[PDB]
Every structure is written in structure tokens, then in C-alpha cells.
Design a binder for this molecule. Structure first.
Ligand SMILES: Cc1cc2nc3c(=O)[nH]c(=O)nc-3n(C[C@H](O)[C@H](O)[C@H](O)COP(=O)(O)O)c2cc1C
Length: 324
């Protein structure tokens, strides 16, 4: 329906991407999005070892014959992670596109480039997107304040961050954070982006491999039901508001709090159980304020189809109508 610099550059049907999703970004998710016409990604670090990732890629290929990418998130953790080996596994597997995120991606970007693997780098500021562009990425994903996950510390929403980035960048731009439907798509495109990336919206789909209680929580949640944890540590993350995030906020409020004082609460091992068991209070789980615009659970195929058709109608009916 839409042809943009994004669809042309990455060879996909729709200007819609399903970026990194720790714990959730497995074969079922990626295959559903790939089969739906969008740019899908398997979460590399969701797999416990480079070998596990190779196997997951194979499993995904059994569910879809269409190409998909892999997200490589650079954890600021101190516990050694065989990043180099994960990269090697991604390349050896024939992956043609990778979405990198985190600090100091340079080393990985260069390696991927040497092997003809395109790179999309998720950034939270214009200065970061520019540095990434100078490093040679194929596109930049501009994550705004609205996003689930790490929005950085500048607190600039997409309405301003996107045009600000479009004013300076040359490579294609992917808008990320706060998008869920055709209205968001058109807004993103008008602001200077060539596609939209979504996370929360994909949690609320039939194929997303998570407990039905989580999908129900997203539908029931309004736009004001998310918390920004670890702001006092300059490691801000937007998560679903629950007993855990609220407790983390209480701890930070007391002042003099360090990561060690919350490591047990924000634990990833604890958060992954939210998606598996469906207990939304077991731990911290990512969700964006965009949940307030979500109240259904379509199959990924119809979802993407409806988004582009809605966007098309907004242009040809609503907007052109105002001009007539
Ligand atoms: C459950 C969940 C897990 C996520 N995991 C990661 C991750 O491991 N790495 C990363 O760079 N972004 C991660 N994200 C962020 C998304 O890739 C995307 O940038 C964000 O969801 C966009 O905001 P939206 O939720 O409003 O669409 C995650 C988001 C969700 C909802």
C-alpha cells in the first residue's frame, strides 16, 4: 500500500517494523510479523547462548519463508556477554538485517557492515542518530519519550524529536515509541520518518507468545498506566505500572538508592515470568503508554493490513477532503 525509503531499503511490503523485545521476541513473534509483511526481529539476548540463537533462527525459518532480522541489545551490565560470538552466529546464519541498540555499538556495526549485513540502530537523540549515521548504519530508529523500554534522559517526545532528527539526518528514519495504528503511521511519515517501529502493539496480537492475561492487561490499561523506573540512576526505563515498579519508585524516592537496592525487584529472571505465568505483578515488564490506544487482539496479518489501509484512507479521505 505504501512505498517508502524503508520498504525499498529493507525489501519488505509494509513500512512497519517489530523491533527488539526481550523474552517476547521469539520465533512465533518474528515469523508472524514477517509473514504479515513487516520487518521482524528475533531477540538475540533472549536466547541464553550463541548456539541457542542459531537454533531459534532455524526454528523461525520453519514458520516463515520470508527474511527477518535480529535485534542485538548492548546490555550495560558488568556480567560478561559473548557479544562477538552472538554476532558471529547472526552472520553465519545468513541474517541480512540487524537492529542494534545500546551504548557503543560501533564495534558491532563495523563487523556487520564488513559482511554485508545492513544495520538499523535505535537511538534516543539526534546527536546519537548522527554518530550512528557517521558510522555507516543503513537507517536509524528514533525512539521518543513515549516508548516502552529505554527512552534516554532527554525526555523529548516523537512530535518534536522526529522532525528535529529529519532536519539533520540523511539515511532513512524509523519512528519508534507511541505508535499503534494508521493515524500514528501518517503522523510519523509527515514528520519526516519513512516507517514506524512498534513493541507494545505487537504484545497485543494473537501470535505473540505470551500469557493471555498479559494481553488482557494491555487492553485494559490506559495511557497513564506506565512508570519510569531508575530515573535516579540515569537508567530510565518505561514499564507497565504494577506493584513492583511502584515499589522501585518508593525506594528511589527515599534517596541514596543504588542499583543493588533494586536488582532483585527489576530482575530479568523475575520479569520474564510475567509473560510466561501471566502474573503481572511477579516483576518488571515493558509496556508503553500507547497501550491506552490498544483494546483488541488481531492476528498480525490483519493488523498490518488495517494499519496501512487506515493510513491510506486518512490521506485520501480525511486530509484530501480538507483540501477540497
Ligand atoms: C516486552 C518488551 C520488550 C522490549 N525489549 C527490548 C530489548 O531487548 N531491546 C531494545 O532495544 N528494545 C526493546 N523494547 C523496545 C521496543 O523495541 C520498541 O523500541 C518500543 O516498544 C517502542 O515503543 P512502543 O511500545 O510504544 O511501540 C521492548 C519493548 C517491549 C514492549
Amino acid at each position: 500500500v505504501f512505498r517508502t525509503r524503508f520498504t525499498e531499503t529493507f525489501g519488505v511490503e509494509h513500512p512497519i517494523m517489530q523491533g527488539g523485545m526481550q523474552w517476547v521476541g521469539r520465533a512465533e513473534m518474528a515469523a508472524a510479523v514477517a509473514n504479515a509483511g513487516g520487518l521482524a526481529t528475533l531477540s538475540a539476548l533472549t536466547q541464553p547462548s550463541p548456539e541457542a540463537l542459531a537454533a531459534e533462527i532455524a526454528r523461525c525459518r520453519e514458520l516463515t519463508d520470508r527474511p527477518f532480522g535480529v535485534n542485538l541489545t548492548l546490555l550495560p551490565t558488568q556480567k560478561p556477554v559473548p557479544y562477538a560470538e552472538y554476532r558471529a552466529a547472526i552472520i553465519e546464519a545468513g541474517i541480512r538485517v540487524v537492529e542494534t541498540a545500546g551504548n557503543d555499538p560501533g564495534e558491532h556495526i563495523a563487523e556487520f557492515r564488513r559482511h554485508g549485513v545492513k544495520v538499523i540502530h535505535k537511538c534516543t537523540a539526534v546527536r546519537h542518530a548522527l554518530k550512528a549515521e557517521r558510522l555507516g548504519v543503513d537507517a536509524v530508529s528514533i525512539d521518543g519519550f513515549e516508548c516502552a523500554g529505554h527512552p534516554g534522559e532527554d525526555d523529548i517526545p516523537g512530535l518534536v524529536l522526529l522532525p528535529a532528527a529529519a532536519n539533520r539526518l540523511r539515511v532513512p528514519i524509523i519512528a519508534s515509541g507511541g505508535f499503534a495504528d494508521g493515524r500514528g503511521l501518517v503522523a510519523a511519515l509527515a514528520l519526516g520518518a519513512d516507517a514506524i517501529n512498534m513493541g507494545t502493539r505487537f504484545l497485543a496480537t494473537r501470535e505473540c507468545p505470551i500469557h493471555p492475561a498479559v494481553k488482557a492487561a494491555i487492553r485494559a490499561a490506559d495511557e497513564r498506566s506506565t512508570d519510569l523506573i531508575m530515573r535516579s540512576l540515569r537508567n530510565t526505563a518505561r514499564v507497565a505500572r504494577n506493584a513492583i515498579s511502584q515499589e522501585v519508585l518508593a525506594i528511589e524516592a527515599r534517596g541514596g538508592a543504588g542499583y543493588a537496592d533494586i536488582a532483585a525487584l527489576v530482575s530479568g529472571q523475575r520479569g520474564r515470568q510475567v509473560y510466561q505465568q501471566g502474573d503481572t505483578d511477579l516483576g518488571i515488564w515493558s509496556a508503553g503508554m500507547v497501550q491506552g490506544l490498544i483494546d483488541d487482539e488481531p492476528a498480525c496479518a490483519e493488523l498490518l493490513r488495517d494499519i496501512v489501509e487506515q493510513a491510506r484512507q486518512l490521506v485520501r479521505q480525511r486530509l484530501e477532503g480538507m483540501l477540497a
